[PDB]
Design an enzyme around this catalytic site. Structure first.
Site, PDB file in Angstrom:
ATOM      1  CB  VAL A 258     -10.540  -0.309  -8.942  1.00 23.04           C
ATOM      2  CG1 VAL A 258      -9.041   0.159  -8.908  1.00 23.04           C
ATOM      3  CG2 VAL A 258     -10.677  -1.702  -8.322  1.00 23.04           C
ATOM      4  CB  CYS A 259     -11.791   5.289  -7.345  1.00 24.12           C
ATOM      5  SG  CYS A 259     -13.412   4.779  -6.699  1.00 24.12           S
TER       6      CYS A 259
END
Length: 292
Positions: A145-146
């Site tokens: 999850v960026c």
């Protein structure tokens, strides 16, 4: 005389925050897991320092989450905390309306590391179709999850994890706001230049077509078939309450994709297969008990 939305909100509100027995302690103090969890190795090898300041902060996190999770027909957040460990969590976010994620259920694992809050929480998206789906420029096949708030994406210094002012609620809201968006194609840096060009429009559509079919398959069909034990009730009630709406949405998505283009045809065809299986699950679904 409540609307469908009001009825949905009322039902889902009760399921938003709770504890769950995710781990169990041994005689030898050793943790054994009861559910699947991405950070089991980090938990097992934590060499727990037992920091009191961290404990106080984690309990502050939980208090916020117990009262302030986003809730709406379009998109809602659901959280489960382990019954004893403050650093182990699981979350479910439903996809916002008017996005290729709409009404899908997306599961994430969460670990607060031993150096929290100096360092951000670790978040992993579990709904990847066994790594077969890249759900977003900011959601890797492996689950990464960026977000800049997670220090997993570029941004200004005020957009980074801040040990004093950041919180996990803010991270959750950043997923809704920044990842689960309409036209996710343009989240890839540099691609924004294409926006508003026929080349751009066409690429975004093909992108949307793939994300649509994957949502129906993995964030809907397989969530019903095989829910996390943490979120079984949420899933059941979510899909039951919205079943009519989801069938109309799937039809609308199919209508829209068929306006276009060999790959559009590939997407339209996957979507149709997934939709027909989903219709069979939706109909088969027993009526949930906590409705009234």
């Amino acid at each position: 005389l409540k609307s469908l939305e009001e009825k949905y909100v009322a039902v889902m509100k009760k399921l938003q925050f709770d504890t769950f027995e995710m781990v169990s302690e041994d005689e030898d103090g050793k943790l054994g897991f009861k559910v699947n969890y991405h950070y089991m190795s980090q938990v097992k090898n934590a060499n727990d320092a037992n920091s009191a300041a961290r404990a106080r902060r984690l309990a502050q996190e939980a208090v916020t989450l117990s009262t302030s999770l986003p809730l709406s027909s379009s998109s809602s957040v659901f959280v489960r905390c382990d019954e004893e460990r403050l650093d182990i969590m699981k979350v479910l976010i439903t996809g916002p309306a008017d996005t290729p994620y709409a009404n899908g259920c997306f599961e994430f694992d969460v670990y607060f590391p031993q150096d929290y809050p100096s360092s951000p929480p670790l978040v992993n998206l579990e709904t990847t179709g066994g790594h077969s789906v890249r759900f977003n420029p900011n959601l890797y096949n492996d689950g990464k999850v960026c977000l800049s708030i997670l220090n997993t994406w570029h941004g200004r210094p005020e957009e980074k994890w801040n040990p004093q002012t950041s919180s996990f609620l803010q991270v959750l809201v950043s997923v809704q706001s920044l990842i689960l968006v309409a036209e996710p194609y343009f989240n890839e840096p540099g691609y924004e230049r294409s926006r508003g060009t026929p080349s751009g429009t066409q690429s975004s559509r093909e992108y949307d077509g793939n994300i649509r079919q994957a949502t129906v398959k993995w964030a809907m069909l397989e969530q019903i078939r095989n829910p996390s034990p943490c979120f079984k009730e949420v899933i059941h009630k979510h899909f039951y309450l919205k079943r009519v709406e989801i069938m109309a949405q799937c039809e609308e998505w199919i209508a829209d994709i068929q306006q276009y283009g060999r790959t559009m045809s590939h997407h339209a065809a996957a979507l149709k297969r997934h939709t027909a299986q989903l219709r069979e699950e939706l109909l088969k679904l027993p009526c949930p008990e906590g409705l009234d």
